[PDB]
RNA sequence: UGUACACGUGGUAAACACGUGACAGCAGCCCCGAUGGACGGACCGCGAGGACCGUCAAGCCUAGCAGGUACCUUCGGGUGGGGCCUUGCGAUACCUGCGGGCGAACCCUGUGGUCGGGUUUGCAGCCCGGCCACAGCCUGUUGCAAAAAAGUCAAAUAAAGGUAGAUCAGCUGAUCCAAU
C-alpha cells in the first residue's frame, strides 16, 4: 500500500535529518559515561547491567588512533575456507521458510523493545507508533525484492575492553549495533528457523529450553562412573573462540544451500553479507566504512542461529562408535553455548573426534582457540586399583598441543565471564565483576541492585559443575559482603542475616551461594529422571549424583526453616529468625507484617539519593556509631565512655540520641512537624477539612491532638507519634490512642469545633511508625480504613521517620561543646 | 567395624540360631576469616587480648582451591580453633603450585630463556605484560638529600696540610555520599 511506503519513507528522512543533525580528558569522558550509564539504566535495567559488569565504563583510551589501524585490517580479511567436502556432506546426511509474513507472528516475536537506537536513529517509538498491518507490509515487501535499504543495514561497532587496565588496542572487544527495524525483521527468520528444523538432542545451548541444565549432571555422573569403576575417560573442552569472527560468508551460503533451504534465502542471506559496513565509533567520532569478510556478526538475532547449522554439521562429522559407555548409554558430544565437550573411551577415539572437529572447522573457516581449550584424562592401571592424571601434552588440533588439565576448574559453560583455561578459577573472575561495579558511575542502590539480580545469577551455576565443598561458597560469600559493605560503608559487626534477608523483614536480601546452591542442586537433580532427554535420565541413577543429592538436602535443611502453610524449606524464613533474633536487627521484627515499611530499600530507591540511601540504611541497622554501638568490647573503661555526651548521665545509646535527649529536642520536634504537615496535605487532597495543632483547653489539663479532620458529618483525630521498636509498636498505638478515644469531654469538645453533634462520629486514631521506618500493623490498617489513604502516601512516612532520625542523629553530632 | 530393628526359615516356646534389608537409621548443636616471621629487652588488669624496642633473612600466616605421597580405614571417605551440652557409630602427617594480605626487594638500558597473551593457514615474524639471569683537624669535584639550607664530623678521595561542586595532595591527575 501506498501508506505504508510514504511512511517508510517518513521514517528515512527522519532518520536522515538525525544523522545529519549528529554529523552538522578524564573528567569528561567520566560525566559522559556516568550520563550514559545513567539514561541506560533508567531505560533498561538488565542490559545496563550487563554492560557494568561487563567492564564497559572505563570505554577505550587509544581514540580513533592505533584502533583504526589495529582493527580495519583485522575486520577486512576474507577468509579462505575451501568450503564444504563430500564427506562433510555425507556426514550431514546422516522447505516452509520465506512465506509471506501474516500479523500474528509479528505480534507474537517476543521482540524486547527496551534496547538502543541503531545507527539511522530509530530509538523507541517511531517503530513502536507504526501498526502491524503496516510493518507486515514492508516486511513482505522487503523479502519480495530481496533488499534492504541501505540506511538500516549500517551498523556501529564499539570496543569495550577485555583488561581493567588495557595495555593495547587489542584488548578490546568490537560490539556491534544495528537497526531496529532490520533486528525486528530478524527475529521472525530466526524464530521461523527454530519452527523449522530444530537441532539435535547434543546441542543444548540455543534451545527452547535451559540448555546448561543437565550437562553438568551428565558431565558429573561421567567422571564418577570412571572414578568409581577404574574406566578410561577422556574429556575435552574446545571453546569456540571467533566463532563469531571468522566464519567465511561464501562456504556459510554454500553450507545453507546443500542443507535444502529455498533458494531465495541463501540469496537475502549472501546480499546481506555481501553488502555489509560498518563505522567505528570511538569517543564519539566517525570513521570510514568497513568492509567485513568473516561472518557472523556480533548481536544480529541470525547469528546465534546461523551457527546451530555450522554445530550441527560440526556434530554429525564425529565418529560413531566413540564416546563413553555411561549405564549403556553412549554420551559422544555435549555442545554448550560457545563450546564442544567430547568424551571418548580410547585414546585413539579422543585423537580421532578432535581430528574430525579441526578438519570440519579448517574447511569452513572456523578457528578454535587452543589457548582457551583443555583435555582431561583419566587412565586407569592394574595391579594398583587407582586412577592417574595425565600430565604431558599427547592431544593436539591441527599441530597445536592441547594442554592436560588435572582437575575440573573450567566450569566455565555458562555464558558470559568467558574461560580462563586452567589458569584461574571461577574466582578472580567474580572479583574482576566486583571491581567492575565498584568502580563505575552509578548509585549505592543501583550496585545493590545490580549485584542482587544480575550477578549472583549468572555465575552462581559454574559451582555446580563439580564437587564442591561449603568452605568455598562461605568465602565467596564473605567476599560478596565485604564489597557490599565498601559499597555502603557498612562497619564489620553488622549482623550477617542483614544482608541476606529478605526485603519484606528488613534487608539488602542479596542471596548467599552458599544457601542457593543447595537450593539451585536440589531443585535441579530432583527432576532429572522426569526429563526427556535419555542420558540425563541414565545420569539420574548413578552414585555421585545421589551422593551430591543427599549432601544438598543436608545443606539446605541445615539453612532453612520448614515453611508452615506449605511444609517446604525456606531459606529466607532461616535468615529472617536470625535476623529478628540478633541485636540491631532485632528492633525490625515487626517489619514482616507491614510490607510497606520496607518499600524504599528496592522498590522506591530511583526517588532517594545516594547519601540519602546510605544513612537510611545505616540508621535502619543501626550502624550509627554511639558509644555504646561503637564501644562493643571495649567497655572496661570508666563511666565516660558510655554517659551521654550531653551531660544525661545515662547510658548513651542510638535510641537516648534518636529519641529521648535535651539535645535533640528541636530535631524531633522537626521531624514531627514533617510528618504532621505530609500527612496534613495527605488528607486534604481527600476532601479532608484539616485543623493542624487544635486549641482545646480541656478541663482536665492542655491536650494537643495531632490533627483533626472531618468529611460530610463524621470526624477523626489523628495524633502522630515516632517510637522506639524494642516494645510492641501495636501496645504503643492502642495507648496513644486511648487517651482520646476514652477521654470522654475531648470527643465532645472536637464535635463541637468540627460542626457536627453525635459524639460517636468523630473516631480516634493514630499514625504509630518507629524511628527505623516500621509501621504499625493496627496503625497502618486503621490509616487504610477510616481516611482514604492509598498505598503512595504511606509508603513515604517511612522515609520521612528515616530522614528525621538521620536528621537528628547529626545535630546531636555536629555540636558538642 | 559396632550398635539399637522389620521380614522369612525350622522349632512347643524362649533371654535360640541363620539369611535378606526402607538411599534403612543412630557418625549432636552453636560461634569464629584473623596477619608478616625467628631469635635478645622493657609494658599492661604481668590473667583470656593488644602496643613498643633491638638485629636477621626473605620469606610469614591461610576452617580458600587443585594435584600428587603415606597411615587409619569400612565399603562413603577422613586432618582449624572455641563453647554448650547431651548420648548423639568416624576418621592424620607432611611436601608442591595457585588465590588472599603482610613482607621484602624492584627500578641502567638492552641482550636471552620461560609463562600469559593476542596478530596470523602457521607455536615463523610481530607487538603487549609477569619472572629469572647478564655486556657493562677543615680549603674542593662526586653518592644517602622535598629545591640554594638543614649537616652524613673517620663517605669514594689526592705532593689533600584548573573542574558542574568539594576535597586530598604534587595547571595537571585521581577520589567522592557529588555526578544524565
Known sequence: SPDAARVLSELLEGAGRRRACRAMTSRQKRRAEYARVQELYKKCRSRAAAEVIDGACGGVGHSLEEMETYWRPILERVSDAPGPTPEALHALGRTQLWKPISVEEIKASRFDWRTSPGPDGIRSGQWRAVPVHLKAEMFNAWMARGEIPEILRQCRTVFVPKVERPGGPGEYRPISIASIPLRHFHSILARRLLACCPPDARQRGFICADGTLENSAVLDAVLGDSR?????????????????????????????????????????????????????????????????????????????????????????????????????????????????????????????????????????????????????????????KKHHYLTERTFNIGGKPLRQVSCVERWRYLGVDFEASGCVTLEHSISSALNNISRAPLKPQQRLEILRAHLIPRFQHGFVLGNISDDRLRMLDVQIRKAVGQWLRLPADVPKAYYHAAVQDGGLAIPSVRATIPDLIVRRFGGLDSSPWSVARAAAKSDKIRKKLRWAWKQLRRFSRVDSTTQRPSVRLFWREHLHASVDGRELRESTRTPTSTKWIRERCAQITGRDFVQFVHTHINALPSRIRGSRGRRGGGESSLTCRAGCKVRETTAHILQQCHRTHGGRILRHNKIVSFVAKAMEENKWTVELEPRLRTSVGLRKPAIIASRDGVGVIVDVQVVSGQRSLDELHREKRNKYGNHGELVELVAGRLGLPKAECVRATSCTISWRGVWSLTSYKELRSIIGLREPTLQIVPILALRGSHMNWTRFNQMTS
Not at 267 to 274: F, R, V
Not at 301 to 328: C, H, K, Q, T, W
Request: aromatic share 6%; with cysteine; hydrophobic share 45%.
Open 228 to 384: 568409581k569403576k577404574l574406566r578410561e575417560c577422556h574429556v575435552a573442552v574446545l571453546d569456540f573462540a571467533k566463532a563469531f569472527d571468522t566464519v567465511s560468508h561464501e562456504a556459510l551460503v554454500e553450507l545453507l544451500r546443500l542443507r535444502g533451504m529455498p533458494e531465495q534465502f541463501c540469496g537475502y542471506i549472501a546480499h546481506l553479507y555481501d553488502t555489509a559496513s560498518t563505522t567505528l565509533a570511538v569517543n564519539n567520532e566517525m570513521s570510514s566504512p568497513v568492509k567485513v569478510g568473516r561472518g557472523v556478526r556480533q548481536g544480529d538475532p541470525l547469528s546465534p542461529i546461523l551457527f546451530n547449522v555450522v554445530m550441527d554439521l560440526i556434530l554429525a562429522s564425529l565418529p560413531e562408535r566413540v564416546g563413553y559407555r555411561l549405564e549403556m548409554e553412549l554420551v559422544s558430544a555435549l555442545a554448550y553455548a560457545y563450546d564442544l565437550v567430547l568424551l571418548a573411551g580410547s585414546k585413539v577415539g579422543m585423537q580421532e573426534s578432535i581430528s574430525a572437529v579441526d578438519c570440519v572447522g579448517r574447511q569452513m573457516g572456523l578457528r578454535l582457540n587452543c589457548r582457551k581449550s583443555a583435555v582431561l584424562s583419566m587412565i586407569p592401571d592394574g595391579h594398583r
